[PDB]
Amino acid sequence: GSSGSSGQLLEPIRDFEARKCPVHGKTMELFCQTDQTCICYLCMFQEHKNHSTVTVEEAKAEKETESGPSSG
Numbered sequence: 001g002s003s004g005s006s007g008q009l010l011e012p013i014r015d016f017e018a019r020k021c022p023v024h025g026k027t028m029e030l031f032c033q034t035d036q037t038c039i040c041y042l043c044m045f046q047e048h049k050n051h052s053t054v055t056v057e058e059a060k061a062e063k064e065t066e067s068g069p070s071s072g
């Protein structure tokens with residue numbers, strides 16, 4: 001049948017490529033553990049070199065269901 005609904009969902013760029021470093025301008029794909037703030041790769045190298053930076057994805061795993069052990 002045709003009648004009914006259809007997924008084919010989609011969404012423009014609203015918050016996908018809008019989270020960039022205000023100092024560099026590079027999409028922030030990391031999260032500092034010292035100041036618990038978002039930062040770019042160029043930052044973890046300079047801005048936050050000492051602090052313990054972790055890929056945003058990693059910081060999330062914590063919020064969501066527990067995660068398995070892995071020696072990053």
Ligand SMILES: [Zn+2]
Nearest residue numbers: 021024040043
């Ligand atoms: Zn930066």
Ligand SMILES: [Zn+2]
Nearest residue numbers: 032034048051
């Ligand atoms: Zn930091």
